[PDB]
Amino acid sequence: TAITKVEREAVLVCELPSFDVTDVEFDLFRARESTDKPLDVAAAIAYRLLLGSGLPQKFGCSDEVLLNFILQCRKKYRNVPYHNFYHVVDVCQTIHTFLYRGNVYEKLTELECFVLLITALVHDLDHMGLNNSFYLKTESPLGILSSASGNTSVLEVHHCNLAVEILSDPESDVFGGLEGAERTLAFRSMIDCVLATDMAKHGSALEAFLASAADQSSDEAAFHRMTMEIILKAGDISNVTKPFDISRQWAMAVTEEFYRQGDMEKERGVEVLPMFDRSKNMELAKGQIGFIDFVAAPFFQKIVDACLQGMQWTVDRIKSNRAQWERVLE
Ligand SMILES: COc1ccc(C(=O)Nc2c(Cl)cncc2Cl)cc1OC1CCCC1
Ligand SMILES: [Mg+2]
Ligand SMILES: [Zn+2]
Numbered sequence: 001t002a003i004t005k006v007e008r009e010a011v012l013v014c015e016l017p018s019f020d021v022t023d024v025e026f027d028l029f030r031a032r033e034s035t036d037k038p039l040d041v042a043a044a045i046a047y048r049l050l051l052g053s054g055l056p057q058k059f060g061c062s063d064e065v066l067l068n069f070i071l072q073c074r075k076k077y078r079n080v081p082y083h084n085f086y087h088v089v090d091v092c093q094t095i096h097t098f099l100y101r102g103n104v105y106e107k108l109t110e111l112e113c114f115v116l117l118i119t120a121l122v123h124d125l126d127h128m129g130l131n132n133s134f135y136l137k138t139e140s141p142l143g144i145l146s147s148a149s150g151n152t153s154v155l156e157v158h159h160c161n162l163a164v165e166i167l168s169d170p171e172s173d174v175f176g177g178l179e180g181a182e183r184t185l186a187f188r189s190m191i192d193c194v195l196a197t198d199m200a201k202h203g204s205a206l207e208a209f210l211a212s213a214a215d216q217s218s219d220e221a222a223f224h225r226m227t228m229e230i231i232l233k234a235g236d237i238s239n240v241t242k243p244f245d246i247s248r249q250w251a252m253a254v255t256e257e258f259y260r261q262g263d264m265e266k267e268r269g270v271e272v273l274p275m276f277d278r279s280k281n282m283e284l285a286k287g288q289i290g291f292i293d294f295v296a297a298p299f300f301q302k303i304v305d306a307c308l309q310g311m312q313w314t315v316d317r318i319k320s321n322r323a324q325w326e327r328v329l330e
Pocket of ligand 1: 197198199236237239240247250251252254255275287288290291
């Protein structure tokens with residue numbers, strides 16, 4: 001279904017006064033509250049980020065095709081508490097800061113940077129607020145296909161299907177100005193990156209990045225592809241790297257989405273992990289401190305020390321946020 005001029009214009013009128021979408025302290029929550037059309041403000045933010053990068057122009061992507069693409073993506077996000085359009089616009093904004101404030105763009109081609117910013121916006125398409133384990137536990141029809149065809153990444157394959165669908169329309173094909181090996185690389189790297197966001201692949205992903213970083217000269221292509229995967233993963237788990245009040249609001253949203261999954265599991269009589277169990281009754285800080293200690297702090301420290309020195313602020317902020325969660329526990 002084609003994007004209309006009227007849908008484009010409602011995005012184009014958002015001027016985002018008092019916001020700098022390129023800054024590491026940018027507050028998407030404040031942006032959403034700033035008007036009564038937060039879906040338009042979010043789309044404008046994505047649009048300004050992509051155009052501001054100078055990348056779509058270089059790869060033959062018109063302003064209009066870019067905006068159509070952003071709006072086709074937006075239509076395929078659901079009204080779930082966390083994995084909605086605001087999460088992927090956030091991931092897009094965050095990756096922009098890693099590339100340009102954290103100087104990770106130096107490690108990548110311009111095309112790879114363009115693909116990363118585009119891929120941020122597709123990477124969770126039509127998320128329903130249930131994780132891969134739910135579909136597997138319940139033998140949902142919606143994930144029988146995945147296991148039957150040799151992959152457990154039910155959601156991520158689904159996101160890729162839909163990204164390909166959006167891009168198949170010339171009106172929203174942001175890769176339509178590419179040809180040959182470049183067009184092929186855009187699609188392949190986009191899909192590799194989305195598939196790599198499955199946290200069941202987190203450990204192997206991180207360890208494959210660290211290996212290629214320790215020896216970049218031996219296989220440049222591999223290092224480029226792994227750097228893209230790790231930066232999309234970094235954007236995806238970046239909530240704990242933000243100013244505390246922003247970080248706390250993301251944590252509230254993730255937790256509500258998890259609890260809704262847990263409630264559906266109780267309805268089905270299947271297993272509910274404590275992290276998903278509304279009845280255990282919080283507290284927010286305990287879950288955050290745990291996620292920081294066991295997942296997020298070691299991830300950012302390892303990728304920063306290995307390679308990505310310009311992203312040191314992520315480690316600093318994680319440390320800071322952890323201390324604040326400790327104070328909230330009294
Ligand atoms: C804002 O705090 C969190 C942010 C993100 C995630 C998280 O697991 N995100 C994620 C998910 Cl849920 C699925 N695939 C990839 C990723 Cl990165 C998890 C977070 O904390 C959870 C909630 C209680 C402990 C873990
Ligand atoms: Mg995902
Ligand atoms: Zn995501």
